[PDB]
Structure 1
């Protein structure tokens, strides 16, 4: 039985990824940053559905907590076959001097965090393993106030491509999944139906994509059908 670590699996896309990987037969480490309640709910949903999982706290941007995370994750089953990095933040801030704090925070959490996870994955994933990062489709649109977020995720994609090359000879694929707007609980919670309808109309399929539809592409990349997909950023956005 193969083991998968999923960062940011307490809610939303990360939770959907963790639950789908558990359904696919992976033992899932549900990594979370702060309050364990949602993470333990993820673990319990996995166990009730017939899978195995356990939760580990770690801030992905804290090098010491990441060192511990990977040791503790390896302690469970002695192996780390798949690593999926979904944890990140998306604050809004225009490219102005006053936004410098927000910028630093996003870079710290999304990009440095990604580096940490990827770096440790590169050291611990076995031959034949898989490393998957979550990027974003909004990189293609360059919307105002998304500067810091887009910068962080573009950096992540760059790291993904380089790492795919650096792991030559280990038969380890490195890819990214870049979702568009996704119908998480948080997404719906902050929006009126009119706002939802406008976002739905942005895609030619004219609806809101679900977290499970993102997790399905992650599951492809983690499984046998993803054996020959390497150094790719797959945008999952309904055509938007």
Structure 2
């Protein structure tokens, strides 16, 4: 019950690492806004799991990286917080949603560079900007990056550019928000099982597994357990940091 009476928004928590994160924040007593783009069935399943486990959650639909995205998300978020608490306080923001076998550098288009940046860097910035209006002293901003910002993979150049921009939001906003006691940190996963069809193919899972020093792919919960710790009071002396949650991928 480390997060009793707190309110959290996990972007992209219908599926994958965001679902695992929403589930773990709710187990600690947070009221969780489960945000999704279009998969309402998956959002409703995250909420149902949280409720079955004795916590509280509600879904929020908003496609990010289009005109009106932040306003749409905050309309749903504040309505659901106000109905359940009488307040619109936001304690915890997890910028988890993203666009993700990559694109060879020669094949990347301007349209692809714009979509990746819209969703993966621009929307996170604008969500931080809006979220702090509601955020009390002692709040938490957690940006989900990627170990690819430290590990060269040409076919992930477009994606990795956006995660490099995301990490700058961590650096510069940690300094900006320090006076308010709001921390801002990056958590960087390695290859992580998000329930994608590729994780049902043992051959490919075994090749992907070799990337980790533990010679297994990450589970969504392995990353979500680290996010959950950063969301708690005991992380208060960590800000502006790169938190490696990759199972030793950057060791080689």
Give me the TM-score of the superposition, normalised by structure 1.
Answer: 0.94
Per-residue CA deviation, residues 171-211 of structure 1 (Å, 9 max, x unaligned), is 1001111100001211x536632221122122221112110
Equivalent-residue separation in structure 2 for 1:146 and 1:177 (angstroms): 18
Q: How far does residue 66 in structure 1 lie from its aligned partner after superposition?
A: 1.2
Q: How far does residue 8 in structure 1 lie from its aligned partner after superposition?
A: 0.2
Tell me, yes or no, if structure 1 residue 168 matches structure 2 residue 178. yes
Question: What does residue range 194-209 of structure 1 map to in structure 2 within 5 Å?
Answer: 194-209=203-218
Tell me, yes or no, if structure 1 residue 5 matches structure 2 residue 4. no
Q: Report the equivalent of 1:41.
A: 45
User: For 1:233, which of 229, 242, 250 is the aligned residue?
Assistant: 242
What are the ranges of 5 or more consecutive residues in structure 2 without an aligned counterpart?
Answer: none
Equivalent-residue separation in structure 2 for 1:66 and 1:30 (angstroms): 15
Q: How far does residue 143 in structure 1 lie from its aligned partner after superposition?
A: 0.3
Equivalent-residue separation in structure 1 for 2:49 and 2:228 (angstroms): 18
Q: How far does residue 7 in structure 1 lie from its aligned partner after superposition?
A: 0.4
Equivalent pair of 1:60/1:117 in contact (CA under 8 Å): no
User: For 1:58, which of 52, 57, 62 is the aligned residue?
Assistant: 62
Equivalent-residue separation in structure 2 for 1:216 and 1:138 (angstroms): 20
Q: Report which stretch shifted further, 190-199 or 125-134.
A: 190-199
Equivalent-residue separation in structure 1 for 2:181 and 2:78 (angstroms): 20
Per-residue CA deviation, residues 76-99 of structure 1 (Å, 9 max, x unaligned), is 132111111100011722333752
Q: How far does residue 59 in structure 1 lie from its aligned partner after superposition?
A: 1.7
Equivalent-residue separation in structure 1 for 2:185 and 2:192 (angstroms): 20
Tell me, yes or no, if structure 1 residue 148 matches structure 2 residue 148. no
Equivalent-residue separation in structure 1 for 2:149 and 2:218 (angstroms): 18
SS in structure 2 of the partner of residue 161 of structure 1: helix
Tell me, yes or no, if structure 1 residue 216 matches structure 2 residue 225. yes
| Structure 1 segments of 4+ aligned residues over 6 angstroms from their partners | none
Equivalent-residue separation in structure 2 for 1:91 and 1:30 (angstroms): 27
Per-residue CA deviation, residues 119-161 of structure 1 (Å, 9 max, x unaligned), is 1123221111111110001121120211110000000000111
Q: How far does residue 49 in structure 1 lie from its aligned partner after superposition?
A: 0.8
RMSD across aligned positions (CA): 1.6
Equivalent-residue separation in structure 1 for 2:125 and 2:106 (angstroms): 26
SS in structure 1 of the partner of residue 77 of structure 2: helix
Q: How many residues align?
A: 239
SS in structure 1 of the partner of residue 178 of structure 2: coil
Q: Report the equivalent of 1:17.
A: 21
Equivalent-residue separation in structure 1 for 2:159 and 2:33 (angstroms): 26
